[PDB]
């Protein structure tokens with residue numbers, strides 16, 4: 001029992017972290033096979049960030065301008081290319097610690113672990129979610145760019161995020177490993193507001209199922225609802241609309257607890273309308289939405 | 305910016321996890337040098353857990369009864385001994401992945417990361433604190449015993465916890481790496497109630513400083529207080545008394561923000577007396593107490 005915001009073990013990703021320096025800028029790179037992936041803004045000076053023409057800036061850079069260090073050893077750069085907002089630095093040595101990996105682009109509402117790094121060295125690991133407005137709420141300081149987000153399925157690391165930016169609002173933006181930003185964000189120092197940060201309803205429900213599994217049952221009521229009735233309340237509270245696909249996804253949790261999905265929806269509807277009344281659920285005073293139904297099943301079953 | 309419940313990178317500890325089986329019982333062990341450390345209840349059957357005489361049970365066990373597997377390879381056990389509530393299994397091979405390490409016994413209020421494991425394999429990593437009643441609020445299922453808690457200082461892993469038990473109340477109990485339980489807990493299936501779980505005041509204050517650093521400033525007020533006045537309110541709310549040692553420990557955070565410690569105490573006093581009024585601080589609707597002042601400095605400065 002117990003339910004925690006749990007991150008994946010980070011060892012397989014720690015073995016891929018390198019430091020990339022170009023001119024006066026230093027950030028993190030991800031070394032997989034003989035390629036180092038990093039944010040393309042490594043080639044920019046602070047003055048360049050206002051209105052960068054990355055293709056034009058990159059012309060002035062050669063392979064020897066990209067300093068890649070793995071631990072205390074320098075890697076030799078034998079090629080460089082830009083793919084969307086990431087640079088791919090071909091090095092002469094394959095990473096001996098390359099795990100089995102995939103590059104995946106996640107959907108809003110999906111969770112992943114972040115290994116926050118500085119100068120190619122890991123500082124910590126935490127769990128976060130791709131928000132419905134395509135931002136993430138991480139913990140990143142200057143130098144953290146190039147830190148990656150990932151999920152693990154047994155021995156295969158699926159990299160889904162690379163950190164690029166902090167918006168003026170303190171929220172984070174980045175790309176998948178093909179260099180495409182999540183959301184409408186651009187790697188430029190310009191006015192970029194995030195969009196409405198709605199609550200991931202299906203994740204809230206999964207977390208209520210985790211609460212019942214772990215003994216917190218005070219919020220269970222004598223009511224039921226329908227998807228259309230529940231969604232009228234969800235709209236009012238800036239919650240994402242719940243679909244039959246979401247109900248299907250919650251099926252294993254509903255089976256394990258014997259609580260029908262629409263009954264749990266009625267419990268969530270009352271929590272939205274009435275509040276917690278100073279009570280907590282799994283040590284939280286707000287409804288948690290950064291656990292997917294798969295995260296709950298995984299944590300409650302002990303998948304390694 | 306951003307502030308997350310961050311765990312240490314787990315790679316150095318993943319390299320130490322092994323599976324230990326004795327008879328029908330399987331749990332986790334920690335392999336450091338040529339010794340594997342595990343909970344002594346690995347020698348018990350479920351019937352033995354009611355009233356175990358560990359010295360008597362251990363007599364019936366020989367080195368060949370302890371099956372230690374690291375990955376898919378079996379380790380040869382050449383000695384066994386019991387130290388308090390842990391067994392030390394001497395193996396014929398030093399762990400090649402042994403990091404620089406120390407065994408430390410932590411004080412209540414201190415935080416650490418847990419690498420939850422099953423069958424010697426890591427499932428996840430999360431951050432937790434030794435509660436003032438010497439329990440931890442983790443996420444552990446059957447088979448998680450022997451999972452360890454640790455802190456890292458650059459390249460040295462300080463192991464502080466080994467998981468042994470879940471109490472009937474869903475809280476967790478365990479030992480340091482010398483086998484001494486934290487708190488009054490015993491490795492027996494008997495009535496054991498935890499004690500009052502008070503709030504770690506100094507950690508709450510550190511987290512309020514992290515909030516101000518990260519822009520959440522709504523709770524700052526025009527007041528101040530004294531240690532004695534603050535503690536009258538802290539007692540009423542089951543908060544640990546704040547001492548001058550704690551004020552000294554918060555010194556760097558007070559210097560960084562320009563907010564005197566007693567002024568922050570007055571803000572916390574108003575939050576206790578008035579509540580949050582439906583507002584949040586760093587994405588939380590309750591006062592968070594599992595970040596030490598050192599955790600806040602570390603996360604806000606990017607220590608790797």
Ligand SMILES: Cc1ccncc1NC(=O)Cc1cc(Cl)cc(N[C@H]2CCC[C@@H]2O)c1
Pocket residue numbers: 041046049140141142143144145164165166167186187188189190305
């Ligand atoms: C600072 C940070 C914090 C967290 N995560 C990430 C970061 N870093 C960034 O966003 C990188 C970045 C991206 C853009 Cl579009 C512009 C800049 N401009 C810089 C010129 C002087 C300082 C200012 O940061 C930098």
Ligand SMILES: Cc1ccncc1NC(=O)Cc1cc(Cl)cc(N[C@H]2CCC[C@@H]2O)c1
Pocket residue numbers: 001345350353444445446447448449468469470471490491492493494
């Ligand atoms: C189960 C668990 C969950 C989380 N963390 C840890 C655990 N495991 C434990 O506490 C181990 C343990 C310690 C004591 Cl003192 C007694 C037992 N008795 C068992 C006999 C039948 C089943 C029951 O669990 C087992």
